[model samples]
Structure formats: C-alpha cells, structure tokens
Target: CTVKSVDDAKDIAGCSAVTLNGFTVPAGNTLVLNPDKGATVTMAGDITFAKTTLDGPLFTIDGTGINFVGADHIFDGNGALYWDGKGTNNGTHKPHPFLKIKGSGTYKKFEVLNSPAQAISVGPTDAHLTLDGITVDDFAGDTKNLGHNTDGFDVSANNVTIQNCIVKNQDDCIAINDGNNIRFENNQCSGGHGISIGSIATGKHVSNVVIKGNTVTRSMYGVRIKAQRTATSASVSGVTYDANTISGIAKYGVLISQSYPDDVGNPGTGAPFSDVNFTGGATTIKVNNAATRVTVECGNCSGNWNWSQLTVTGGKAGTIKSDKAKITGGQYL
Candidate 1:
C-alpha cells in the first residue's frame, strides 16, 4: 500500500506493506504509525515537517517484526528556525525528539536533517532491534554552534544493535540511558561528545554492553561513561571496548566517571562500575597533543581490568582514581 497524506493513517495500521510518499506534517501534530505485525515500511519520497508549534516527535513508529527502509530520502525538521544555542534545556519552545522509533525489528537507511533539538529516540524493545546505515545530519549546526543538544540517538532499549551509522551533531552520538546486551559497532561519529552511557539515574543498570569497530574523529570527548553525581541506586557492569579508533579529541580520550556534568568532581558511590575492559585487537586512542588520554574517577569499581590491547598516544598522561579497581596491561596514561 502507498500513502500520500493523513487520510491513509488508518490504512497504514492494517497493511503489512506500506510506502510513504512526499507529505507535509502540519503544525501541532504527530504522524504516528502503528504498523501491522511483520510489516515493512519504506519511504518513496522526501517528508518534511513544516515549521510548527508541535510539542514534538513529529513521527513515531511501533510494531513487532517491523522493517523501515528510508531509501536515502530525507526527513526534514526545519531546525534552522530554532537554533538558539540553547536546546530543550531553555530557549524558544523547540519541538524535540523529531523521531521516536520502537518495536522489535530493524530500522535503517534514513537521513534525518536538522532536527530541532534531540534528533532520534529509540524505545525499549522486547526482542532484538537493529539500526543500520542511518544518518543524522546536523553538520550545519557548526554555524555559530547554535544547534544545542542535538543528540543523534537516545536509546533505552535492550538486545539492541546500532551499526554503520554516522552522526554529525552538537551532542552525544548515542546515549545508552538504560540497557543490557547492547552492541554499538562500526559507527562513525563527529563534531559531538562521542559515545556515552548514562548520566544514569536511580534504578538504572547498564550491563553486558560492547562497543566495537567504531571510528570517532574531531570530537569533544572520544568516549565516556558518566553516572549521575547524586544518584541513589544505579550501577554499570560488563562493558567492553574492542578495536575502536579515536583521534583529535580536545578533551579526554576516554572518561569513566561516577560524576555527571562535571568531568571529575566529588564522585558518588551510588553507581558502582564493574567488569569494564578495553581488550581485543587494537583499541587505539589518539588525542590532541595537549589533551589527556584517559581518566577514571570512580567510587565502587572493581576488577583487575586487563587492557593489553589498549593504546593511547599523542596526548598528555591523564588521571586514574578508582576506589576498588586495579588496572593492568595497557600502554596508556
């Protein structure tokens, strides 16, 4: 089935095969799609979200066994009108989360252009969900640095994999708020805060995560794991970094901290980090000649962590302050 306008909304829910054509989503509305089971959704033309007072997620997709292919088409958010150098935190009323995608399946091959604020959000999945070959193009944001907090993907899902994607934005490439058994591989990130896992709040635990084969360049921080400085019941565990390449980091190449916002403050003990490792193949980190290579500020971390495959070069030696963890086997700071 093919859809051209809003009249086809109900028909989309009942069909297993749907093609979306060129359309303009009006102001103050969301184009929500609830596809049928084992459905396939594809874009045949570019979609635009007209300048609107919409509170946001101009688009939402959900269903089991779903497959969304964007066919290199563009989903335009008209963010230039809202570039205030202040994201949703404060500023003119900006529509946030231009796309909220969920369900158990695959979503790929899309280009999101100039999201008003946070670009995309991935919801919790009951089964495996894979995001591949997607592009979040906020590169124009470099104009006066007005695109604030345009995060590429804010994921809170389990059994998820994101691969072969590129995020050129102002904030985190991907923030894993909460999840387990998640894999982020073969991704390219630039002009942002690189990859992050939480500012974890109460009752959030991230475990069994793997970040591999990724390339991060010209970023603020290459990679970081941050827990809320004042959190109560959160923890991170079983995280591994394998064969990732990082360079031109202005800040720390890698920062594992229990303090959020502040790179290194009075770290909290509420979020204990355990079983974190940097191993397998060449996990090379190269920072700016003036930047620090690695810094770990923790409270309740443990592991005689093996980092034999880790290498840090072209940077100043950084700090490591872990309460219960001892590191061994790394040519790092």
Candidate 2:
C-alpha cells in the first residue's frame, strides 16, 4: 500500500497491492478506494481536489475482482473552482459525480482533469465492468460558457464496457441512465451533449446497448434516445449502431425521443421503444446546416427498425412520429 493522504486511504482495506501517491484531497475529505478483493490498483501520481461545499462523489471505487491501472494518472477536479455557468442546473453547489464507480473490475488509464459537475458515475456493478483509456478533460469548461452540466459518463451499470474513451464536456458525452449489457466502443466525443440514451425516469429499463466505433465531433447531439415526458415503467430495447462517425451536429442528427424536455413534445405512454438499429457498418452522420437530420418521436414504439446502415448528411429534415415503429433504410437527405 502507498496512498499518500486522506488518512493514507485507510490502509486500502488491507491492500493486496495499491499505489496512488500524489495527494491533496482536503476540503472536506472524500476519497474512498475499497481495494482488497483480488486487488492490484495502480496510479502513482496526480489527484488534487480542495475546493468544496460538499454534495460530490468526490471520488470512490469499490472492490470485487479489482485491477485498476491508471498509468496515465490525473484526477484533478479543481474545475476552475466550480465554473459558475449554472451547472447541475443551479448556480454553484457543484461537486457532482466527480467520480464514483462501484464493485467490478478492469478500469484503465485515467485522466479526468477538471470536472465540477458530472464526470463519471457508473454504479450498480457486481460483475463485468471495463472502462479503458479514460480521459474526460473539461476543456476548461469551454472558457466563458461556464461548463454547465459537464457530463462525460453517467451510466447506471450492468455488465458495462466503455472503450478507448475521450470526452471534452459540457454535457452528455455518454448518458445511458439505466443499464443492461452495455458497450460503447472506440469512443472520442468532443464539445459535448452527444451520445445519450435516456432522460428516462419512472422505472428505468435499457436493454442491450452497443454504440460502436464512436467519434462524435463538436457535439450537440448525434445520437440520442431520451424517454421522459413523465416516464412510467420505461423500456428501451436492443439498441445498436455501428461504425459511428458523427460530424459537427449542432442539434439533432438522430434523436429518438419520447419527448424528453421537449425535443418533440407530446409523448408519454410509459416508454416502449423497441429494436433500434443502424446495422453493422456505414453509420455516418453529419449535421450542422441548422441541424436536424433525423428525429423520431415515439410514444409507445414497436419493432421492425433496420435503418440499413444509416447515413445522414447536412441536417434539415427532421420529423418522424414512429409510434408504430417500422422505420426501414436510412440516408436522411
């Protein structure tokens, strides 16, 4: 064991082998690290954090078949002393998901440099959990914009796997609220507010998810699936999208909402979106002409959605009330 502060991490639950050296987690201390069950945690440096008011996850990490190795360490959530742009929906009161992962294994290369709001919060894990090459730099909260709701990953775990990550936040770079066999692959999102699935409420239920080979740029939403106009027993089925490469979308490039916060009003039949797909390859999206490539507002959706290797171009053509859900093919003009 060799954690350098916060009471030396309480001896890391009688470590089997831990090592996090750098320190500075003082304002109201909160830095757990439940190591021991098959432990082997690493990371030999950075980890600041001393501007507090509480209400944060501050930083946690449970055990189980552990093996976290953040060779590229750094979790300095100084967050410009809490960017004042009304984050977490209020004026300063920050301290949001600075980082909180639960029981599982295989965490890798970390670097969440500045997060005052949402950063990483994947809970509910008792088995498989793997987040690799993580990096969610707040991008200086984007200068003046103040970095509101800086979300980078807020998953509600269940056999998860987020790979090759990299998100510069301002909002959802990944927000799969509830979970199931999840997998977000080869990630790399920019600005923020892209790659989501659920504003879902009531009794969440997200099924097999797999957004592959990602790369969303200048985001504002390139892949969404919200459900919440008053969700009641929610349900989103087998979701999938392959060969992703969304472009500078400023609005909706592919949103399937049940009217979450009004992306398409009037919808709320207790969520029921079924088999969503984009097939295996060609998932190319490219909005930003005013943005609005695809927008399906379902209330009680059904099946039969193929989207034959989706492919949308410069926005401007959004509106599909697929309540009966039978969307075939793609190529949104």
Candidate 3:
C-alpha cells in the first residue's frame, strides 16, 4: 500500500511491501511503521514533520528482517521553529532523536534534515542491522549558535554496521552508549564533536567496536572515548581505530578519558577500559595550531595497548595519564 499520511501507516502492519509518498506529519503526531517480517519498504518521497513539544522519535520503524530502501529521500524536521540556542539543555522543549529504528535489518540512503536535537537513534536490537549512505544535515543549527546538542547518530544496538554516512551537526557524529560488535566505517563528519564512544553511564557496557576509514573535518575532536566520572559498574573494551583521517580539530585530536564532561581531569574507576588499539592502517590526525594532539586520562584502565599505526601532527601534544595502560608506538608530534 502507499502511505501519503500518517494515518495510512496504521494499515501497513501486515503489509509485505509499503511505499511512503511525500507528506507532512502534523504537529503532536508520530509516524510509526511496523511492516511485516522480511518486508521491503521504500521511500518514494520526502517526509516533513511539523514542530511540536512532544517527546520525540517522531518517526519510528519496527520490523524484523526488513529491507528499507530509501532512494535518498529526506525526513525534514522543521527545526527552525525550535532552535532556541539552548537545545536539550534548556528552553524551548525540543523533540529529540527525530528518527529511531526499533527492530531492523538493512536501512540505507536517507537524509535527516534539521533535526530538533539529536538526529537518529538506533535502538537496542539484537538483530543484525546495517545503515548506509545516510545524511544528517543541521547546517542551520550553526546560525547564531542556536543549535546545542544536535547529535548525529546515537547507537545502542548490537551487531550493527553504520557506514558511508555524512553528519554535520553540533554534537557527536556518532555516540555509542552501549553496544557490541558494532562497526562504523567510511563516514564523513564535520562541524560536530566527531566520533565518540560513550558518555558510558552506570551499568552500561560497550565492547568489540570498530571505527575505520572515516574522515572528520572542522570538528571539536577527532575521536573520543569517554565514561562518566560518577558512573559505576560499567566497562568498555576491545575497541579498534583504523585508517581514519581527521583534520581541522579545535580541541584534542584523540581524547580518551574516564572523567568525561571534563575532557581530562580527575578520572573515575567505574568504567574500566582496556584493549583499545590503532592497527590495520595509519590513523592520521591533524589538528589546529592551538589544539592538543592527543590526551588519555584513565583511572581504571589497563593493558599494553599497541598504537603502532597512529600518527598526529599540526598541534601540541597532550598528556597521557593512564593508571596501568602502557601505550606503545605512536607518533604524536
């Protein structure tokens, strides 16, 4: 069936194939698509959502073994109406994470334009999910410093692969809060906080993650791994960085800290991290003249990690204060 309105999506729960035409989802309403298992859903046109004060994920897709074929269509969140400069911090209650994937298989080739806050959130799904060729554009948020926490992709799913995406926002291009066996590759990130793993909260754990072949430009940081300072009973391990190109960094090129919120400071022992390495290829990073090249502040981390393929230039070198982690072989000049 063809869905030109949000109400028409209600009849698609049992549909094996669904097509979404261009339409506007009115204010205070959410568009949820629950197609049948192994279904093929295609986007024939764009979707625009009116500004509202509702808790978000204004758009959601829930299905098992599905194939979402987006022919480069846009999901337009009228964010101009809500960009109050405070974002999720305060003022003008904004709807965040404009899109969410509940259960999934393969989703590709879509653009999320002007999300109110965070763009896309990949929910915790055990199924194998893959997202490719997506674009998160919040260039308008850069105006007058009106966009505050416009994160690109927030992932908390296992066995997921996100590749060939472009994110231009104010916050993290991708924030992996909790997940395992995840791969992020070949993405272009600009004007954001670059790529990050966690602000890992209490009781959460992230492992076996790979960040490879990505390009980050004009961002605050190139790559970062952060665990909250007050978090407890959490852990992050088995992370790999390979062949990533980064430049125009404003702050640290690579920052690993357990003190989070504060880039580098008195660290916490809650989320013990280890086995983070830079291998496979040279992960080259170039920062601004006033930026710091690299920094590692660990309170409860260990391992003789190998960073033989890591290289950084065009910035002053930062300090490394790891408890028991011995970093070996990296050119940080």
Candidate 4:
C-alpha cells in the first residue's frame, strides 16, 4: 500500500501491509503511525513540513516488532520557522525529537534534516533495535547560534545499537538517559556537545554501555558521563570507551560529574557510578589550548577504574575527585 500525502495517510489506520510513499504533513498537525504488529513500512520520498507556530515532530512511528527501512529518505523539518536562539528548554516552542522511534527492529538509512531542536528519541521499549547510516544535519543551526538544543540522539532504551551515523548539532550527539547493553560506534560527531551518558534524573539506571570507534571533531566535550546533583536512587555502571578518536575539544576531554548544569559544582551522592573503564582498545583525545584534559567529580563513585587504554593530550590537566574509586593509569592533575 502507499500513502502519497497526509490526507492519504489516514487510510493507514487499518493497514497491516507495507507503505511506500511521501507525505507533506499539514502545519500544526502530526503524522502519527501505529502500524500493525510485524508490519514493514518503508519511506520512498521526503516528508516535508509546512510553516506553523506549533511544536513539531511532524512524524512518529509507534508499533511492536516492526521493521522500518528508510532507504535514504528525508524527514525535512522546517526548522527555520521556529529556530529562535532559545530551544525547548528555554520555551521557544521548538519541535523536539523530529522522530519518535518506539518499535524494535532495524531502522536504517534515513536523514533527519534541519531539526528545530532535538533530532531523534530512541524509545520507551523492551526490544533489540539498531539505527544505522542516519544523518542529523543541523549545520544551519550553527549560524549565529540559532540552533540551541539540537540534540542528535536522545536514547532511553535497552539492547540498542546506534552505529555509522553522522551528527552535527548543538547538544549531545548521544545522550543515554536510561538503558542497558547499548553500543555507539563508528559515528562522526561535530559541532555538538559530544557523546554523553546523562543528566540522569531520579530512579534511573544506565549500565553495560560501550562507546567505540567513533570520531568527534570540533565539539565541546569528548566523552562525558553526567548525573544530576539531585538525582536519587539512580546509578550508572559498566561504561567502557574503546578506540575512539577525539580532537578539537573546547571543553574537558572527558568529563564525569554528578553535577548537572554546573561543570564542577556541588556533587551528589544519589547516583552511584562504578566500573567505568577505558579499556579494550586505545582511546585518544586531543583538546584545544583552552580546554581541560579530564575532570571527574564524583560524590559516590566506587571500584577500581582502569584507564590504561586512555591517552589524552593538548590540554591542561584538570581535577579528579573520585569519592571511593581509585583510577589507575592516565596522567591527571
């Protein structure tokens, strides 16, 4: 079956077959899809948005055990219509998370272009998913700092793998809010906040994550794990960074803090972080003249963290206050 436009997409409510078509979503409206279980929906053309005053996804996919293949289509977010300097966090009525991927399976080869704010949200699910060859191009937001909080990928799911992607935005390339057994590899990140673990909130647990073989250039931080200072009953464990090449970092090469919003401010004892190792392969980080090498501010971190495979250069050393964890290897201040 095919849905040629937004008006034609209404027939998809009862569709349990493949849909290959394009859609121009009406302004102030959403193109929501609740595909039947095990259905395969493939995008054949671009989904363009019209001018409107409302926040947009403009598009969403909701279903179970579904397979969505993009085959190189575009989700053209008309971001210029709503890109004020202030992002969603500051109440500019930005259309957040250009795509909400809720189902589990393999979603590949799509381009989310010029998002108003955030690009994609991984999930609220319990299945294995993979997102590959996707591009989030928010380079337009870089003009005059118009793109405020254009996060590349905001993930909140388990057993997921996001690989071979390119992200150029303002916020974190990947923000792992809460999840387990997640992997991010072979991706290119630029003009963003770099790869991050959290600004973790209350009652969240993020564990068994692996970040490897990624290239981060001209970004803020290289690799970071951040937890909110007020978060309670939360934890982050078993994080490993392997074979990542990072350069031109303007902030700390690697920043692990229990303080949210504040760089090295008051720490929190709520989220206990443990077993953070930079082992498996060599991870090299190079920062600019004004950047710091590494900074770890933990109020309740434990265990012996091995940083033998990590090498950082081109920046002044920063502070490290690992509450109970002993970090062996790596040169720190």
Report the number of the highest-TM-score candidate: 3
For each candidate, what TM-score against the reference?
0.97, 0.37, 0.98, 0.96
Say which prediction, candidate 3 or candidate 4, comes out ahead on TM-score. Answer: 3
Model 2 residue pairs with clashes: none
lDDT of each: 0.88, 0.90, 0.92, 0.88
Clashing residue pairs in candidate 3 are none
Name model 4 segments beyond 4 Å from true.
Answer: 13-17, 331-333
lDDT of 1 by residue, 159-253 (tens): 98999999999899999889898899999999999889997888998999999999999988888999988887888888899999989899989
The runs of at least 3 residues in candidate 1 whose Cα sits more than 4 Å from the true structure, single-residue gaps closed, are none
Query: What clash count does candidate 2 reach?
Result: 0
Candidate 2: give its CA RMSD in angstroms: 15.5
Kindly provide the TM-score of model 2 when superposed on the true structure, using C-alpha atoms: 0.37
* Residue-by-residue lDDT tens digits, candidate 4, 63-162: 7777888889988887777788888867568878788888687788889888888899988775788899999999889888888788999999998899
Better of 1 and 3 by lDDT: 3
- From the highest TM-score down, the ranking of the candidates is 3, 1, 4, 2
